[PDB]
Symmetry: none
Subunit: 234 residues, 6 copies
C-alpha cells in the first residue's frame, strides 16, 4: 500500500519496512534501501533521505510514540526523526503530495477488525482532512474507499456502508435522512456525513486540535481516524 | 452498469433492455418491466415511468437520433421520447442526481477498442462535465474511472493512462510536465489535463456548444466523449 | 445439436431419436432410453421424463403434424405429447431455458437447398443478430454483415441474401411474434423483410442441415 | 456414445453418420461435416479427415463387410475406407487412443435381445473388469461380481450370467477372442467358447441387450 | 510409486505391469517392455531381466501366492519367477538396494481402508525391517502417500492423517519421548521409548527374515510377511 | 522439515539423509538419489546438485564440525562442501529462498519452526506468533512472555507487559523487545556478527546456531 502501520498491533501489516521494502503510490516509492538509507524517489529522483547510508541490514519500523527509528540489525538506531508524541498507535503514509507523514494517536475506530484473508493487490483507501495541500477530501454517493474484499461506501440512501465481499458489515444507519450526501472529515478529525442541505445525520464524534488528520480502511476491516500530523518531509 | 449504448456499435453493451432487466446505480434502478412499463425507482418509492402499461414483451432500446423508444413485441413503438438529434452514438445514463439522460452524437474517441473481455461484476466508469451533484467532475492523482480489467488513471507524473489489466495501452505521454494534475471535463466536452497551476498540458481538443457532456471508459476499452444532452426525466 | 426435425424428409437429420441417442444443450441432455424412458437431465438429476419406463427398443419421433410420439418395439405409442396441428414440417426444440418444445408449420424460407444455429424470437436467446453477428451450422452460417445485408454463406460463399447493403451501418435482424424476419436500421425502420406471417405466438428461425432458413410457427407444446 | 454399427438389421443405433452428426468420445470429435468432410477433431484442431469437403449432401455409413463408406445426396461414395473382409456385423469405433477403427467379425454374443467397450489385451482402455467394476449403457450394464459371476442387468434384473459363483476374479478378453473369467492365482472359471485369428478385438454392451465381440481388426488411421 | 500389487483385491493398484509401464525409485525403473522382456535399469544399464524377448502383448502381473508371471497376449505364461508361498496378499517392491523383491502374505493391517481418491504424484511410503532405508522413523520423521501420510510425533504417538485430521493412531502419548517406531526383523512394529522399551506393538510376528510395512493408497497400514523372492 | 542435524547425538533427527530420502520446503526438494548425486529440485527443474552422478549406496550426513560430506557404501566422500568451523553442533537448512545452507555453532539452548534472523522470513514473531514443532511450540504472547510448551503445558518461559515481539539479533541474541524498542528480555550471548537461525528442536530443545558457514 502506501501506508505503514504502527508497532501496534492487532493486525494491519506492514509493521515494518525490511530491506528493499517500499511503499508505493503511482510513482511515489518510499523504499528503505540495501545500504541502510531510507529515501523517497518520484520516478528516478532522490527528493528525500536520512542520508544514513554505508551500512547493513537496516530496517524501517515506526514506533508507538511516533517515532521513525531506523534500526540496525543489533537494534541500534542509525537514524530517528525525533518528534515524539503520545501513546496510542500510529500510521505513516506516502501521499499524493509527495510527502510521507506520520499521523496519531488515533481518535475514533468502528470496531470491525476481523482477522484473516486480507490482501492489497494494489490500492485505494484513506480520505484526507480538508487539508488543501492531495486527495480525496471526500466522499460523494457512488463514491467508494476500497481495500480489497472490503469497501466503504457512500450510499444514495444517505448511508455510509461498509461491505465485506458484497455483504453489508457496518453502516452509518442514516438511509433516507437524505439526498446528496457526502461524508466529510473535519480538520479536527471528525467524520461527518452531511446532507444536501448541509446537515449531519451522522458524525464520528470525537475531535481534537485542528491540524491535518486521515480516515483509513485498514487491512483488518477496521475503519479508524488518525489524528496527529506529528512529522513529515518537504 | 448504468449506461445503455444505443443502436451503433463497438459492442459496448447493453444495446437493449428487455423485459425485466433493470439499469442500476446504488439503490436507484431504471428497469424495463414486466408489462411494458419503463420505470425509475429509488428502492420501493417510485419516481418516473412512461405509464405505458399492460402489454407484452415491450423492450426498451436506444436510437441513433437520440430517441429512447419502447418497442413492441412486434416492432411497434409503445411510447417515444420526442426529441431527436443528430446522427450518432448516444449513451442513455442513470446518474447520481436520480435522473436518466441522453448525450450524443459523440465527440472525441481515443481510438483504442477491443472486441475481447469487456467486463463488470458491479461498477463505475464515467466522469461528469461540471454543474447538479452528479459526480466525478474531476479526477485526481491516484483517482480513476474503472470498468474491469480496464482502468484510467491519473498518475503523479502528470499522465492520464489506460491499463488493460496492468498494462499500458493508451497514454498522454505528458509525464513530468506537472506536479499536481487533474483531468476535468469541460462545459463544452473538452477533456483537459491540467497542471497545478491551471495550465493544460493536454486536451481532447474538440468541443461543442456548452452544456453538459460525459466521457465513458467504454466496455470496448474505448475512451469516448458524448454531448449534446438531449433528455432527462 | 439440440433440434429434432420431424419427418418430412430433406436432409434435416435427426428425424428420430433411437435408444442410446439424445439431444444435448450442455447440461441439459435429452435422452431416449434403454428402458422406454424419455428423459431430460439437467447435469444428471433427472427433471422430466414420459415415465413410460417398462418396454424395449423404443424410439422418439415427432410427428408430422407435430405430435412427438414414443413408440414401442412394436409401433404402438406409450407416450404422446398430445397437441398436433395442421400438417407439413415442425421442430421439437431443446431450449436454453430447459423448456423442451415445438414449433410449426414451416411458414417461411430460403429456397436454396441440397450447435450455433437457432435464433429465438421476442420472448431464451439469441433474440437478435447484429453485425460480426451470426448463427453457424457447419460450413453454413447466416450472418448479418455490416453493409447491413443479411447473407447465407456455404463455405464462404454466398448462397442466399437479403440484398440490402450499402444502406447501413444501422442494422440488426430480429424475428417477430407474428413471424416476420426484418432487417431493421439504426433508427427503428423496416430495411427488408420476410413478407408473411401468421399468429401472435412464439417463433424460431433455425438454420438447417439443408443450406436453409425455416421460421417455424405458431407453437404447439412445451414441458 | 462413441461407436457406429454395420447396416445391421437388428437395431442397434447409430447406423449412419449424417449431416450435422458426429460421434463423440469426450475430448474427441468425429462428425459429418456439411461440405462432405468426415473429420476427426481434438477440441478444435483437426486431426484427420477424408479430404473430401467438395461433394454434395453427404452421410457417413458403415458396411456389411466393414467398409466405411461416405457417399452423396446421389448415392455415390466419395471416399471409402479400404479393406472389406467377411460379411456379417462390424463396429467403426473412435477410441480412447484417438484411433478411428473398424472391428469385424461378430464372434460371440450373449443372445438376450456413455460407457460400454472393454478393449483387448492390446495397446487404450478398460482392459479388464474386477467387482463394483462394470461397463453400463443405460438401464443396462455388464458388471463383475465379487461373488465371481458375470451377470447382465436390465434395470436391476439379471438377463444373462456366467453360472460361475470364488473370490478374486476379473474378466479379461483374450486377443484371439474369448472373454475370460480368470482368477486370483490364475485358473479360468469360464470362457466365451471360441476364437479366432489373432488380433485387436473389442467387446461392446449394446442397445440390443447383449455382449458381442467384434474381432476384428480391419482398418484404422 | 515402486510397488506392484498382488492381484488380491480390494483397493490399491497397480494390480499389473502393462506394456510401457514401469515402477520407478529415482533412477531405477523396473518396466515391462514393448517386446515381452521384463527389465530393471539404473539409468541406461540392463541390471536384471526376464530375457523372455520376441512376443507381444505381455503383461507383468503378480500373483496370489506370489508367483510373478509375465503373462501373455493370450494368457499363456511366458515366464514366472519361481517360488510360491502360501496365500493372502503380496507386494513386489523395487528398492534402494537396487532390487525387485516380493514379500508376503501379510501379517498385520490397520483396518483403515478407503475407496475414493487413492493417490500419487511421486513417492515415499514403506519402511524396511533392519539391513535399504527408512528402517526407522523418528519424530519430525515420517512416511506419506498422499492426502494421507502417517508419522511419529513427540508425545510419542504414531498417527495417521487424512488431509489434517487424524484417523488412526497408536494411542500413545506421554508414554516416553524417546519415541521412534521400527519394524522388527520379524515383522513387528514397536514404537519404542528412548529407553528402548515398547509402549505399543503390532502383535503378530512370525518367521525372522526381511519384512516390509506399507502405507497403501487405500489408507491401509499393512505388513507383508514373507520375503520370498528377490532379483 | 528441511533442516538436517550434525551427528550430535541427541534426539534431533535427521542425522542423515539416506537414498530415497530427502528434504523439502513446499516446492523445494533436495534428496539423496539412488545415483549418488544430491540434488536440488524446484518443482521439476533441477536446480543445483553435486554432479557426482555415478558412485553408489550414497548418503548425505552432516559433519560434526560442519562439513557436509556425501558418502559411499564404503565411507567415501564424493563431495564435501569444503569449509568446516570448530566443533559440536550445526544444522544444514533448505531455506525459504532455495539457497541450501550451514549454521554453526550451538550458542544458547533453552535447556516450520526455524526463525531467520537479519536478511527469507519469519524474521520475527509477535503475540499470536508461533513456531511450531509437534508435541510443541515457541509462542510470544501479549503478556509479552515467551513460553515453549509441549501440549499447552509449559516448559520454559522468559517470564516476561504488552506489544512486545521477539527477534534475532544481528549476531545471536533472542530479544523480547517492548513496543518502543526496549529489551523486556534477552538471551545473553553475542558471537561473530553473521547470519543466525534459532530452531525449535525435536528434543523440547530450542537452540541458536550462528557465525555461519557454506551456502549454494
Amino acid at each position: 500500500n502506501n501506508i505503514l502501520f504502527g508497532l501496534s498491533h492487532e493486525g494491519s501489516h506492514p509493521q515494518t519496512l525490511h530491506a528493499a521494502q517500499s511503499l508505493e503510490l503511482s510513482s511515489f516509492r518510499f523504499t528503505m534501501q540495501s545500504d541502510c538509507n531510507l529515501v523517497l524517489f518520484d520516478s528516478d529522483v532522490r527528493v528525500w533521505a536520512s542520508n544514513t547510508a554505508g551500512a547493513t541490514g537496516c530496517r524501517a519500523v515506526l514506533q508507538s510514540d511516533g517515532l521513525l527509528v531506523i534500526l540496525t540489525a543489533q537494534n541500534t538506531i542509525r537514524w530517528s526523526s525525533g518528534t515524539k508524541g503520545s501513546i496510542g498507535n500510529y500510521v505513516l503514509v506516502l501521499q499524493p503530495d509527495r510527502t510521507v507523514t506520520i499521523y496519531g494517536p488515533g481518535l475514533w475506530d468502528s470496531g470491525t477488525s476481523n482477522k484473516g484473508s486480507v490482501v492489497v493487490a494494489n490500492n485505494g483507501n484513506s480520505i484526507l482532512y480538508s487539508t488543501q495541500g492531495n486527495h480525496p477530501q471526500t466522499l460523494h454517493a457512488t463514491q467508494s474507499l476500497q481495500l480489497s474484499p472490503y469497501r466503504l461506501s457512500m450510499e444514495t440512501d444517505c448511508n455510509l456502508v461498509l461491505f465485506d465481499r458484497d455483504d453489508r458489515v457496518w453502516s452509518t444507519n442514516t438511509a433516507g435522512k437524505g439526498t446528496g450526501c457526502r461524508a466529510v472529515l473535519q480538520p479536527n478529525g471528525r467524520m461527518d456525513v452531511l446532507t444536501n442541505q448541509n446537515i449531519a445525520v451522522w458524525t464520528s464524534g470525537n475531535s481534537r486540535s485542528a491540524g491535518r488528520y486521515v480516515f483509513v480502511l485498514q487491512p483488518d476491516r477496521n475503519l479508524a481516524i488518525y489524528g496527529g500530523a506529528l512529522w513529515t518531509t518537504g
